[PDB]
Amino acid sequence: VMANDIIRIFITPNDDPNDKEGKQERLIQVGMVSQVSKVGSYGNDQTQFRITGQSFVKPFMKFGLGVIQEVQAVLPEVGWLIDGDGDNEVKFTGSSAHEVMTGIIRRFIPYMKYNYTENTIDNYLDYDDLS
Amino acid sequence: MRRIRRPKVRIEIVTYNGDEFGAKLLGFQTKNSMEDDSSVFQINMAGDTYWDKL
Amino acid sequence: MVVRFQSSMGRSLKRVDSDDLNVKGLVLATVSKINYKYQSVEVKVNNLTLGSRIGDDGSLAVPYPK
Amino acid sequence: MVVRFQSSMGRSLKRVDSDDLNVKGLVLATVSKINYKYQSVEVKVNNLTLGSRIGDDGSLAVPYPK
Amino acid sequence: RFKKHVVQHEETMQAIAQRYYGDVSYWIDLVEHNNLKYPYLVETDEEKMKDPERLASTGDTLIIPIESDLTDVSAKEINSRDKDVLVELALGRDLNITADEKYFNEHGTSDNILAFSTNGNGDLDTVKGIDNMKQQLQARLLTPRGSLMLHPNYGSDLHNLFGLNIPEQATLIEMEVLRTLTSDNRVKSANLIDWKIQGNVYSGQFSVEIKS
Amino acid sequence: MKTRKLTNILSKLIDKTMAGTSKITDFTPGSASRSLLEAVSLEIEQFYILTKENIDWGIQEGIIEAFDFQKRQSKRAYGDVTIQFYQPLDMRMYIPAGTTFTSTRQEYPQQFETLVDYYAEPDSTEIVVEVYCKETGVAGNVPEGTINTIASGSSLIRSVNNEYSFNTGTKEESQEDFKRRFHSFVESRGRATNKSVRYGALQIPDVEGVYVYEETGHITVFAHDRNGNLSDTLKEDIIDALQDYRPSGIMLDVTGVEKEEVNVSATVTISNKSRIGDTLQKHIESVIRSYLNNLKTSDDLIITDLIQAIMNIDDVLIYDVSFDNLDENIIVPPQGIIRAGEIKVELK
Amino acid sequence: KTRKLTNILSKLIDKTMAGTSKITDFTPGSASRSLLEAVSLEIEQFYILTKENIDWGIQEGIIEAFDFQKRQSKRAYGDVTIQFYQPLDMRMYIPAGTTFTSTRQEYPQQFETLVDYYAEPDSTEIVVEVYCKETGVAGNVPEGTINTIASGSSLIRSVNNEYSFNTGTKEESQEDFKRRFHSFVESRGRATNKSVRYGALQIPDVEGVYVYEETGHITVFAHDRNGNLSDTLKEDIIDALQDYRPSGIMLDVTGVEKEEVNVSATVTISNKSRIGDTLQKHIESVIRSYLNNLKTSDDLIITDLIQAIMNIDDVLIYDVSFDNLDENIIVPPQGIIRAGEIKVELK
Amino acid sequence: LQKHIESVIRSYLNNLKTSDDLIITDLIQAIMNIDDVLIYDVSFDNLDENIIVPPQGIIRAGEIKVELK
Amino acid sequence: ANFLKNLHPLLRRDRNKKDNQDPNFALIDALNEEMNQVEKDAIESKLQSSLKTSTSEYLDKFGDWFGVYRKTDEKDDVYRARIIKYLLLKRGTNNAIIDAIKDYL
Amino acid sequence: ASQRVDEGIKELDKNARKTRDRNNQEISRRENTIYNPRQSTNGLKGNIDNMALIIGYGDGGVS
Amino acid sequence: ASQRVDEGIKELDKNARKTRDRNNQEISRRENTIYNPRQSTNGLKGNIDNMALIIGYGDGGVS
Amino acid sequence: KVPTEDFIEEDVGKSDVETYSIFTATPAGMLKELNGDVFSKPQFHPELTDRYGYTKFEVENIYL
Amino acid sequence: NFIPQPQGLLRFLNTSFVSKFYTPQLQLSELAKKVLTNIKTDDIPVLEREFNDNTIIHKANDTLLKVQAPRMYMILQSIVLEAYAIVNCFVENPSSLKYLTEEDVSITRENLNYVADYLGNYDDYNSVVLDLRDLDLCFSAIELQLPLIKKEA
Amino acid sequence: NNFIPQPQGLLRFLNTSFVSKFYTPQLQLSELAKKVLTNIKTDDIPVLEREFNDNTIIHKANDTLLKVQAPRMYMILQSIVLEAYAIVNCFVENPSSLKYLTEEDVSITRENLNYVADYLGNYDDYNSVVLDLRDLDLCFSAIELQLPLIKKEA
Amino acid sequence: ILEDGKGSPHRFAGLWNQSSDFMGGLMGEDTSKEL
């Protein structure tokens, strides 16, 4: 189990043939693993493996928007009319949270690439219907 | 074959004789760690003698 | 343990909260643009610009010593 | 208990860490020497001197308001 | 270590690799240990006559190193050329001191018995292989426990165990001999096979499971 | 061995199957047996092709292992970068060592760094410092106006720009050049001859394009480096190296080479009217000037190779090239090298 | 390059699925899958064969064309004959692996027969080939040593090998193989100072040869034979160097002369109490040994002599001077310095 | 190499004491500690005779000039 | 080893003694013959890797790498001999020049 | 398909892989704003990933 | 070999040990870019340390 | 050395608690980029920053 | 929204002996026709670097098939256009995948076999055939899988 | 040379009848020594500006009168140091210098090492030098056994 | 590995020394400079 893998869990509430309303295979939780470790107390003659993770909070939490101190990014006799250019400054504008949040998420989500055989976080996370 | 072990603890003290102090030993702990900026140990002693005055 | 997975920073364990958002101390910046009518400037951080709100010169700006 | 023996300060228990090293607020000092060529001074604390590094006047010094 | 193997009639190297190592893919590296050309196994005897050294046929002895030593380049290089010398090197070499095999049996637990000999021409005799192991075991059994001047606790208390030839003394002697034989890590274990006490002479035999 | 294609192998398999006491079988398309035979034939063809490729690679590896003749590594790209300040410096400034020069275009993200210290004296509105490409490859041959970024730069800097493209970075040694040098070495095994002295002079990495002019009891070698110069230490090293290869009992001498300057004044016709611009003109000028350099000694100023080299940039975009005065080839003497020259582009 | 079993098997399965619609099951044990696996295994074996052939080619194949022999640790072998008391009356069997022990106790070597042999119905003798168990030069045995057979019989009388075992072989590393080739290629150089020196050194009784080069003539002289050169050696070496000399350039050969040096030096010692016969004798011996060991055409620089004599002991020696040595003595190319008469005075 | 030789000469001359006196042969031995294969000949243009130091004074390096030829 | 040795044990490895026609035997024989021919070709590839036995295109590659190209209507033996001899020019010597002139003649 | 794609990617130059990464990032930006050749769609990407190397669909493969 | 290397190092002066440490640091920062000599290679660098020390590869040695 | 014969219990595994992409060792706080010489010169890996972008790790050294 | 193409591929794409098993028909697909018109008319973005030394780089142009067998060279261009066309839609702009059909890929594989067999005669130029055989089985998978993809999508 | 400098004294030293019954010396130079010696002769090598470690074997040879008393024996000492110096360099740095040394070249060093040891043992002056070289005599033999095996491993 | 405290050879992975200087243009900075 390499780290950062995605695990989905489904729980069957009650019997299948009984035709109860619980027969829905509702997903209980999905998240990204971030730790695996051996566990065992050989005095008790028992061992176990424990895996833990978070529900898609790992990418945003780890992705830290750092600061670059000593980059000029000049051009010969050419400049950018809008200020805050050449440097890494990025400005988000909008008249509502759903407009601003869409720009914030859309700025960094597609480039956060991973080794999924099939896609990235955008396909899994809808982040729509915001108001 | 299974290993056989016979622990025998000795204690020395420098400012009561150290040997008498080590006789009444019952147990001790020694917490040493590089993660924190302090190393601390604890020693458990029997109630045969009044160590508070010594 | 499982519950320890929260916001944290530093080699020693510290609970990151709204206190970390507050800026401790003073910082330097360079003057990029000056509103001559109100004589209130907007200063540029190395990768950010303070002020420069929708208000041109009057409603929001950085005062200057007199 | 045994594990409580760490760096601490104050009547109430507080974990002393790198935060305590940071100086909160402003302090006063007296001018002891001035580098006239660069016009940057070195100020003396009651039992310490800030600045006064190996660099004479230019590389390291305390600026002054203009 | 390495397990001895004999080439079977109408057998391929792939089956040989699969039987021991499980996965046939390891055969690519196993051939380098034997130091064989592309005709690894050939039934025709006259075909091997062209270059017997770099070829193998039915009835020949192969080398099967363990998985840990299979990937080692040094093991490959050593097993490519040594071939039969591996067993002698695996069990070591030492000077032979069994000058009088008939005489040393007559004086048990007696000093000034063993001595050097000469074999070949102008060189001291040497022993190797299983003979060296047997000689070392016999010397250890004869050597008393606390007599050597360095690395003590080497030998046995056989001299002190003489008694009333009663069954308990016999079992004590058996256990002492077993402990002496099992002291060397090369030998796996030992166990008595037969006991025989008649009159005033103790007789018996033991079996030892030597590795490889 | 001889290459066998799929069709021949399939035909042989079909013939063997028919002749192997089997009349019930048929080899019509869509049958499992036909598909299996085709797959086997393709596998055998793949094996033969890979065997031939392995034979070629083994021949190359054996030739490399044989003797002590091996190809040399690539050369890091380097050039000149111009710095423009807003105003002339009032006081002397020191550039920290290891200053990083980069660009912003996605096509050329390769980095550059300086190797020696530099100082910006006061009352100087510009300064030029050499740079070297960290990556070993042809990626350092960036076009004009590519390097436009500087690290640890003060506010005094107004712009960063390279006046000319590098055109100096190279990949690993070409197969043809290695083969030619090996031929020179093989022909140079017999000592005391022109080819032996040629190989002895050319074996030094620094020297390039030497010439030998044998005379009656006198040998002259016009050796020069990539820059066309000949330092005393390198000259002495060449003499010492040739001493082993020098024929016994005859004089040897070396006096460098004399440079010559000619103005081509080339003119080029371009099919695409829109693509015409100053950048293309500067690129053509730099390409022609680089072609003038890195030229060996004692070769006429051939124009056919010049036009084929400049046309190699783009066959379709570049239509035709013509010249005014240098149509005829210029014969160079043994001690003449055509390195210098001013290029003026006159687009039609 | 070579490809493994998995790649070939996957390609075969993919092509079969692409072409064949009648086959869909590929479980283990299937006849079609077994056939494809066997084909892939044979293909991989052929790939390994080509890999080994290429390895041999790069290692020694290109050099095999040139005149040199390779060794592959072939175990020693030779012909051996066996004799019987009377002619046989049956086809006796000689199974492979028969051990022909060495009769001599000093020789622990042993030999084995790889192939079986069938005795003729009535032949009184037969000769068979036997291979040694041990490789290398150690397997060589002198003549008349193999006279014992482990599988003895009443009819068998004795064994003997008329011809000695010469096929003993030992294998060296690739560097040893390449060094001889490099020496052979380097030796083919001619018309150069180093090549002429090597050619002169090839002939025996040629050591310390010095070559002096000029545009007009080339002179070669040596003191190879006990410090002297003979006329017959000059005649022999003139002819040999004809192949080595440059074409159209004169070649000359001459002897070696010497110029004895007379020196009467003086040394001042800080501690005059240490002087004695032994000290001055040692100083004279050191001086004469230093002067004797001079290279050909080496000028006798007085500075070098001062450095050598004063390096014996810095504390002991305080001043030095030469009464009969004005300046450094220049010598021709053919001259060599020698100690004629040496005297040392202590002050 | 000229700078190295000058530094060596300075170190040698400064190491002398009042009891010691400058000697041409001693200087030659000191400078010729370098391997004789490299330095083949050494001579002095000015120094031709030994210098006797007065008992109170001490001889030591002043301004040294060294050149090939 | 061979294809027959590594084949499945259950599959036949001999002609059937019940009917002349044997498609299984035909396929196995064809595959075995093809693999044996490929094995023979691979064994012969060792000769081409060495200059002492390289022929046709491989000898041409050897000569090109050595700089001695093939003369028109030149057979393999003389071409290989000239390639090998080309490394022993020993140029400069008078007898070497005489030998070169004789070869040219 | 996966094996030969990996072999081709390993054989590619570092600049080619960098350009492939750039193209993958660009395609990711433009997102918005058991295996069997027959009767299966799971192996669709394997066939496509095999392509873009035999045909120079950019200076490197995609996906 | 390690025993005599340790014995020899004990006699070295302060400057020799300092130069040895500096050389070890120099080699360390540019790396990536049952004793029996017969039938084994475990004791390779041990013999080199004594030979380097006694002959002298630098003032103090390397490794 | 210690074999498994002396192991009573074990709890060991990987963890992504510490994860940084950019590393630097800045000088003392007195020096500043605006009113002085160069302040920092960090280092990074092009592949590492893709998973964790611009994750900095700053340490102040009093010696420099 | 199109990835810039290499200069070499752009130049390549923009413009007796007979086999007994497979023969060509010189038929172009509807999808291939549309892509050809787009490149012919619209000035698609192009790259400036040529690091990737594979595919047509120094293999399709280096070989003498261009001058010796121009008719065979036409077949190779058709396969490249068909190969490029199918790769185009799946990677980006899948709306153009509607025009593709089973018969478009079926003819392409037959053309590939015909040119591949002819190249087998030449011993020097087997490198081109090395890639074609791998590409040959790629089209077959699309042939046996394309109808399911359209209905699924 | 590529990585770090070397002492001045060693660089100066390196650049430049009696017979033993058991040993027969020869003057066969190793292939590695042939190329490495040229680099030492040339100036293209870093070198320090100071010297330490006076207890090394090189200073012992310089102090004694072996140069003038027995220059032939002094020459052999330089040859032993040359091969010894080169084989130290390759392992620490520049692995490309491998496959240029053979067991025969290393083996002959012991023959020369023992040959000169006997002559040095005739006098008590060279006791320190004899004590050092005998330590290296067993050192080279270990390299000889492992050199064929190490070469294949690398 | 136990020999001479060698440890795990995989500790000094390929990314141990291979790296490059840190500058902008990797994300967002370069989008506006595509002239």
Q: How far is CA F123 from CA D37, E103, F82, F89, F90, in A?
A: 21, 108, 16, 5, 6
What is the helix (H) or strand (E) element at residue F56, kind and residue range? helix F32-65
Which positions ≥6 away from F202 have C-beta within 8 Å?
F181, F184, F208, F210
Nearest Cα residue to F267 out of F205, F325, F210, F214? F325
- Helical H segments across chain D, by residue range: 18-21
Chain C residues at the D interface, defined by Cβ less than 8 Å, are 10, 12, 14, 24-25
What are the tokens at N91? 């392992």
Distances (CA, A) of C27 to C24, C44, D63, G207: 9, 11, 14, 84
Do E90 and E130 touch, CB atoms closer than 8 A?
Answer: no
**Residues whose CB falls within 8 Å of the CB of residue G267, separated by 6 or more in sequence, listed in order:** G283, G309, G317, G319, G320, G344, G345, G346, G347
Angle between helices E130-142 and E167-182 (to 10 degrees): 130
> Dihedral sign, CA of L39, L45, L48, L49?
positive
Taking the C-alpha atoms of residue L34 and residue C46, their distance in angstroms, rounded to an integer, is: 10
Q: What is the token pair recorded at G247?
A: 């074409």
Identify the H or E element spanning F82.
Answer: strand F78-85
DSSP single-letter state for residue F293: S
Cα(E38)–Cα(E93) distance, integer angstroms: 34
Distance CA A94, CA G203 (A): 98
Q: How far is CA J38 from CA C13, F39, F308, G28, M99, in A?
A: 56, 18, 52, 20, 21
Q: G205 and G224 in contact (C-beta within 8 Å)?
A: yes
Question: 3-state SS of N6-54?
Answer: ECHHHHHHHHCCCCCCCCCCCCCCCHHHHHHHHHHHCCCCCECCCCCCC
Q: Which stretches within G58-162 are classed as H helix?
A: 62-64
Query: Between helices M126-143 and M102-121, what is the axis angle to 10°?
Result: 160
- Residue E148, C-beta contacts closer than 8 angstroms, at least 6 positions apart: E154, E155
Task: Centre a 10 Å sphere on the Cβ of residue N47 and count the other Cβ atoms it contains.
Answer: 13
Q: What are residue G251's DSSP bridge partners?
A: G218
Cα G31 from Cα I11, distance rounded (Å)? 8
How close, in Å, is residue I10 to chain F by CA atoms? 20
**DSSP per-residue letters across chain A:** --TT-EEEEE---S-TTTT-TT-S--EEEEEEEEEEEEEEETTTTEEEEEEEEESS-HHHHH-------SB----TT---SSSS-SSS------SSHHHHHHHHHHHHTTT---------HHHH----S--
F120 contact partners, CB below 8 Å, separation of at least 6? F89, F92, F93, F94, F95, F127
Distance CA F339, CA F291 (A): 9
Q: Which of G309, G304, G265 is nearest to G286 (CA)?
A: G309
Question: Cβ(G222)–Cβ(G208) under 8 Å?
Answer: yes
Residues in chain C: 66
Contacts of G244 (CB under 8 A, 6+ apart): G190, G191, G195, G196, G199, I93
**Are chains J and A in contact at 3+ CB pairs closer than 8 Å?**
yes
Q: What is the residue type of K40?
A: S
Among F89, F135, F88, CA closest to F110: F135
M4 with M50: CB under 8 angstroms?
no
Determine the number of helices (DSSP H) and then strands (DSSP E) in chain H: 2, 0
Number of Cβ within a 10 Å radius of residue M122: 16
Distance CA M21, CA M25 (A): 14
What phi and psi, each to the nearest 5 degrees, are found at residue K50?
-65, -45
CA G84 – CA G101 distance, rounded (Å)? 18
Between CA F78 and CA F132 the distance in angstroms is: 4
Chains D and C contact (Cβ–Cβ under 8 Å for 3 or more pairs): yes
Buried b / exposed e over F17-52, threshold 16 CB at 10 Å, is: beebbbeebeeeeebebbbbbbbbbbbbbbbbbbbb
In angstroms, the separation between the Cα of residue N74 and the nearest Cα of chain E is 37
Write down the residue that tokens 């004694």 correspond to. Answer: N64
What DSSP line would sit under E37-95, residue for residue? -S--SBS-HHHHHT-STT--BTT-EEEEE-HHHHS-HHHHHHHHH-TTHHHHHHH-EEE
Q: Look up residue G298 and give its amino acid.
A: D
- Give the rounded distance of the alpha carbon of N6 from its chain centre: 15
Question: Taking chain H, what is the end-to-end CA distance rounded to the nearest angstrom?
Answer: 14
- Residue type for J40, please? S
Q: Determine whether K54 is exposed, middle or buried from the number of CB atoms within 10 Å of its CB (0-12, 13-18, 19+).
A: buried
CA distance A59 to chain F (A): 26
User: Hey, what are D19's tokens?
Assistant: 């935060």
Question: Coil, strand or helix: which one is O29?
Answer: coil
Owner of token pair 């030469």 = G322
Give the separation between CA H40 and CA H32, rounded to whole angstroms: 9
Residues in chain C that come right before a backbone break, where C and next N are over 2.5 Å apart = none
With beta carbons less than 8 A apart as the criterion, state whether G164 and G78 touch: yes
Q: Three-state SS string across G190-258, please?
A: CCCHHHHHHHHHHCCCCCCCEEECCCCCEEEECCCECCECCHHHHHHHHHHCCCCCCCCCCEEECCCCC
Asked if residues G297 and G335 have their Cβ atoms less than 8 Å apart, the reply is: yes
Q: Count Cβ atoms within 10 A of the Cβ of residue N72 and give its class: 0-12 exposed, 13-18 middle, 19 or more buried.
A: exposed
Q: Best residue in G37, G50, G73 to probe E by mutation, most E CBs within 10 Å?
A: G73
Degrees, nearest 5: CA angle E119-E121-E123:
70
Q: How many Cβ atoms sit within 10 Å of the Cβ of residue M9?
A: 24
Distance CA A74, CA F157 (A): 9
Distance between CA atoms of residues F125 and F93, nearest Å:
12
> DSSP of E144-164, one letter per residue?
BTT--SSS-S-SB-GGGG--S
N8 inside 8 A of chain H by CB: no
CB contact under 8 A, H25 and G319: yes
F329: DSSP letter: P
A:O CB pairs within 8 Å: 23
Torsion of CA J35, J37, J43, J46, to 10 degrees: 120
Answer for the pair F103, F149: CB distance below 8 angstroms, yes or no.
Answer: yes
What dihedral angle (degrees, nearest 10) is formed by the CA atoms of D44, D49, D55, D56?
Answer: 30
Q: Cα separation of M79 and M12, whole Å? A: 12
Residues 6+ apart with CB under 8 A from F312: none
Report phi then psi at E128, rounded to 5: -155, 160
Q: Which residues of K touch E74 (CB under 8 A)?
A: 39-41
The rounded distance, in Å, linking the Cα atoms of E104 and M12 is 94
Contact M58, M66 (CB under 8 A): no
- Rounded Cα–Cα distance for residues G188 and G190 (Å): 6
Q: Is H6 helix (H, G, I), strand (E, B) or coil?
A: helix
Q: Residue L61 burial (CB < 10 Å; 0-12/13-18/19+)?
A: exposed
Distances (CA, A) of F267 to E138, F309, N5: 102, 15, 56
Least CB–CB distance from I46: residue in G56, G66, G243:
G56
A57, C7 in Cβ contact below 8 A? no
What tokens appear for G120 in the block?
Answer: 């003729």
C-alpha–C-alpha distance, residues G98 and G57, integer Å: 37
Query: Residues J15, J17, J18, CA angle at the centre, nearest 5°?
Result: 60
- Cβ-Cβ contacts under 8 Å, F98 against chain L: 41
Q: Which among F145, F150, F151 has CB closest to A76? A: F145
G305 is written with which tokens? 């002599």
**Residue I89: burial class (beta carbons within 10 Å; 0-12, 13-18, 19+):** buried
Nearest residue of G to residue J36, measured between CA atoms = G17
Q: Which two tokens stand for residue G240?
A: 């040999």
Instruction: Give me the phi and psi of I28, to 5 degrees please.
Output: -65, -45
Q: Are residues H31 and H12 in contact, defined by beta-carbon separation less than 8 angstroms?
A: yes
> Nearest 5°: phi and psi at C45?
-80, 170
- J-chain residues within 8 Å CB-CB of G14? 1, 37
Measured CA to CA, the distance from residue O24 to residue C47 in angstroms comes to: 11
Q: How many CB atoms lie within 10 A of CB C24?
A: 10
Residues 66-125 on A with a CB inside 8 Å of J are 106, 110-111, 113, 117-118, 120, 122-123
Residue holding tokens 């040339």? N42
> E strands within C1-66?
30-35, 40-45, 48-49
Residue N148 near residue K40 (C-beta atoms within 8 A): no
Q: How far is F292 from G114, CA to CA, in rounded Å?
A: 73
Q: Which long-range contacts (C-beta less than 8 Å, at least 24 apart) are formed by D34-40?
A: D35/D61, D39/D64, D40/D64
The residue among M43, M35, M131 whose CA lies nearest residue M85 is: M35
Q: Is the dihedral of CA C43, C49, C51, C54 positive or negative?
A: positive
d(CA G99, CA F96) in angstroms, rounded, equals 82
**By CA distance, what is F152's nearest residue in L?**
L38
CB distance from O29 to chain F under 8 Å? Answer: yes
Distance, in Å, from the CA atom of M25 to the CA atom of M42, rounded to the nearest integer, reads 29
Question: Which partners does chain D have (≥3 C-beta pairs < 8 Å)?
Answer: B, C, L
Smallest CA–CA separation between G273 and chain H, in Å?
Answer: 19
- CB-CB neighbours of F193 under 10 Å: 20
Task: List the structure tokens of E139.
Answer: 């010397």
The 10 Å CB-count burial string (b at 16+, else e) for G281-305 is: eebeebbbbbbeebebeeebbbbbb
| The two structure tokens encoding residue K61 | 């040695």
How many Å separate Cα B35 from the centre of its chain? 24
Strand duo L56-60 + B40-45: pairing: unpaired
The whole-angstrom separation of Cα G298 and Cα G338 is: 11
Residue type present at position G79: D
Residue F170's nearest CA partner among F131, F145, F139, F132 is: F139
CA distance N100 to N144: 14
Nearest CA among E7, E14, E10, E8 for reference residue E31: E14
Q: Which residue has the tokens 């343990």?
A: C1
- Technique employed here was cryo-EM
Q: Are E45 and E59 in contact (CB under 8 A)?
A: no
The CA-based angle F185-F191-F193, given to 5 degrees, is: 95
Structure tokens at G292: 């004797």
Ramachandran angles phi, psi of G200, nearest 5°: -65, -45
Strands G110-112 and G99-101: antiparallel
Instruction: Check: CB of residue F86 under 8 Å from CB of residue F158.
Output: yes
Contact indicator for F214, F247 with CB cutoff of 8 Å: no
- Measured between alpha carbons, how far is I30 from C31 in angstroms, rounded to an integer? 87
Q: Position A107: which residue type?
A: R
Give the single-character DSSP code of G103.
Answer: S
